[PDB]
Design a protein around this ligand. Structure first.
Ligand SMILES: [Zn+2]
Length: 76
């Protein structure tokens, strides 16, 4: 849920895989844009969802093209 920062829209370009193993689920994220895994880990939800970084890293054109201008109304 939205406890702290806001902007979990990047998730729309990623999907969490099942645990199907000893390690608890929600360990990695599968990019629905290209299909690359993007882990997060501790201390990640600090505004710019680790995902975003990947989206603007390669999908920079996708973000700009889409109706997504700025992702920080009260952040700099
Ligand atoms: Zn990707």
């Amino acid at each position: 849920g939205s406890s702290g920062s806001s902007g979990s829209e990047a998730w729309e370009y990623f999907h969490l895989a099942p645990a199907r193993a000893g390690h608890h689920p929600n360990q990695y994220a599968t990019c629905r844009l290209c299909g690359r895994q993007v882990s997060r880990g501790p201390g990640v939800n600090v505004g710019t969802t680790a995902l975003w970084k990947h989206l603007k890293s390669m999908h920079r054109e996708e973000l700009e093209k889409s109706g997504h201008g700025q992702s920080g109304p009260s952040s700099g």
